[PDB]
């Protein structure tokens, strides 16, 4: 019997174990209305073209329990069989009490019965279409259906085609910070639970007393976290798969107010509340639709924690997003799942690609082709060792920035110098450093000008003190000594291009001469290198 998938966390590192070894989700995620047998023919070709190893796809409460007590797993049966035929794995997305803050995917007998399953009430007494996490009947009903889905996987998915489940989808509330219903006010205007007071090491009191100006938001996050933890515990008691929640992000630099962003989700200001309230939820995953490097880089920093494995549970499917695979994996990320990878005639532009076509898919296939050939080796190095990864750090030049034209000719040479500097990244690899640059020839040392559009990146894993696994894309990687060498010289000892067969390295060729004189130059094609550096005495 195949071992259960498990999220391992050790010495601040994390692995998603699948079939007893670390695994990387090189994902594809459907649009929101592809969770039906007839839609699957519009999902698989994209997944094949992408080279994805894992499909993220919804399972909706409305579809599995359309009449109370009358369960229907017909979709899950077809999805399992067709995934198995393609030798891919699944992440099921439980669309239930919350889907983007709302109950649209709850059955009609739930979402149309507000007295049994109550909505968030604003301070002014107006109601929002967002179920209250203090609704005890709604918690019992969600938990009961979730348990029936997990019983379906316990009985029908013994080899764990499904490796992980997302509990709810982008929880929270737009339009208000919390529930201000009478039922919610009786809990708010009362003692904070001792367990939270103890975990945050705070002094006992009421929500307002203990949290002050943050009481309303922290209250909603705590109550939603508890609700999602209870659904999670109930499901894991049936089959103990990894389970996670996906966050409708607030802007980490300039968030605005809770309710403008989805209040109560796992936003960066309430990760402490979520971790204290929901010990059974494996990780809190960001849904990334910010296109600019600085903001995305900040999200990856905030969500990668000693207590939080990094899973990019959604990302935009426009071209600029593909290169974020590199920093995601460099952070020890367990996966990456671009959203909207199907041909069901929908695009979420402006969040994603304006057009969905083979070119849209190819931007992701090209970076997946760097990782797929080493996926198990990379996953093990990421968990047990030292890895790094970078993306091209300037976004594509805007029409408003092309401003460049109105610049004097000295402002221009200075711009070119400034861009070359910004397109040059340093990595400290112990005894050796790497310098990664973007958008230059494969010969000579003309400064980097960037790729058009921005697209490059690099992955490095340490194999030994002087040996690295390297693959990169539309970039140059150069090695150098990390520390002054006291009389010694240094060189590349050997660069081998090759592959892993049955976990053994197979060399195909040695890079040397022009291929190593000017750093290690990558285009759009996949090359996996083993780089051995040496210092040597000359005296
Ligand atoms: C600044 S910004 O990046 O432009 N802010 C955008 C963040 C708001 C986006 C909400 C995303 N929701 C996700 C969840 C998926 O299920 C599906 O709905 C999907 C959307 O296509
Ligand atoms: Na990892
Ligand atoms: Na060093
Ligand atoms: Na150094
Ligand atoms: Na090769």
Automatic annotation (TrEMBL):
The DUF5597 domain sits at 364-522
What Enzyme Commission number does this protein have? 3.2.1.23
> Which intervals hold domain Glycoside hydrolase family 42 N-terminal?
42-192
Entry GO MF terms? beta-galactosidase activity
| Keyword Hydrolase among record annotations | yes
InterPro entries membership: DUF5597 (IPR040719), GH (IPR017853), Glyco_hydro_42_N (IPR013529)
GO BP field: carbohydrate metabolic process
Its domain of life reads: Bacteria
- A cellular component term (GO) from this record? beta-galactosidase complex
- Keywords in alphabetical order: Glycosidase, Hydrolase, Signal
Enzyme class, UniProt record, top EC level: hydrolase
Protein name listed in UniProt: Beta-galactosidase, putative, bgl35A
Phylogenetic lineage: Bacteria, Pseudomonadati, Pseudomonadota, Gammaproteobacteria, Cellvibrionales
């Amino acid at each position: 019997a195949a071992p259960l998938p498990e999220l391992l966390s050790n010495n601040g590192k994390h692995a998603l174990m699948v079939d007893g070894a670390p695994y990387i989700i090189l994902g594809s995620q459907t649009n929101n209305s592809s969770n039906y047998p007839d839609a699957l023919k519009d999902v698989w070709p994209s997944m094949e073209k992408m080279g994805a190893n894992t499909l993220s796809i919804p399972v909706a409460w409305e579809q599995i329990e359309p009449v109370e007590g009358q369960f229907d797993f017909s979709f899950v049966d077809v999805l399992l069989k067709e995934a198995r035929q393609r030798k891919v794995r699944l992440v099921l997305l439980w669309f239930a009490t919350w889907k983007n803050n709302a109950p649209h995917y709850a059955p009609a007998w739930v979402k149309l019965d507000n007295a049994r399953f109550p909505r968030v009430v604003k301070e002014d007494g107006d109601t929002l279409n967002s179920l209250s996490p203090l609704g005890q009947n709604t918690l019992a009903a969600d938990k009961k259906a979730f348990v029936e889905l997990m019983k379906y996987l316990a009985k029908r998915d013994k080899d764990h085609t499904v490796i992980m489940v997302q509990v709810q989808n982008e929880v929270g509330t737009y339009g208000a910070v919390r529930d201000y219903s009478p039922m919610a006010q009786a809990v708010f205007n009362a003692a904070v639970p001792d367990d939270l007071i103890q975990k945050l090491q705070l002094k006992p009191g009421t929500w307002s007393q203990v949290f002050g100006r943050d009481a309303d938001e922290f209250f909603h996050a705590y109550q939603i976290a508890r609700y999602c933890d209870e659904v999670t515990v109930a499901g894991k008691a049936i089959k103990n798969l990894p389970m996670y929640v996906n966050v409708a992000l607030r802007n980490p630099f300039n968030p605005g107010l809770p309710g403008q962003y989805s209040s109560g989700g796992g936003t960066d200001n309430v990760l402490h509340i979520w971790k204290a309230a929901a010990p059974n939820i494996d990780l809190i995953a960001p849904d990334i639709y910010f296109r600019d490097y600085k903001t995305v880089s900040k999200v990856l920093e905030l969500y990668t924690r000693p207590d939080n494995a990094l899973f990019v549970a959604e990302i935009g499917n426009d071209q600029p997003f593909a290169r974020y695979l590199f920093p995601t994996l460099g952070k020890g990320g367990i996966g990456f799942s671009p959203f909207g990878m199907d041909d069901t005639d929908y695009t979420n532009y402006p969040l994603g690609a304006k057009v969905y076509n083979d070119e849209t898919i190819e931007q992701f296939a090209q970076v997946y082709r760097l990782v797929n050939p080493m996926m198990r080796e990379w996953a093990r190095l990421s968990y047990q060792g030292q890895v790094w990864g970078v993306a091209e750090p300037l976004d594509s030049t805007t029409e408003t920035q092309k401003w460049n034209a109105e610049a004097t000719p000295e402002e221009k040479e200075q711009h070119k110098k400034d861009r070359a500097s910004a397109l040059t990244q340093q990595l400290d690899l112990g005894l050796w450093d790497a310098e990664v640059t973007y958008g230059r020839p494969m010969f000579w040392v003309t400064p980097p000008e960037g790729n058009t559009p921005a697209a490059g990146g690099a992955l490095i894993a340490q194999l030994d003190d002087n040996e690295y696994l390297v693959t990169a894309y539309k970039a140059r990687v150069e090695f150098k000594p990390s520390q002054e060498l006291a009389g010694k010289k240094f060189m590349i000892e050997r660069v081998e291009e090759g592959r892993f067969e049955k976990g053994k390295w197979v060399m195909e060729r040695v890079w040397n001469g022009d291929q190593t004189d000017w750093g290690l130059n990558f285009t759009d094609r996949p090359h996996l290198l083993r780089v051995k550096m040496a210092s040597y005495s000359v005296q």
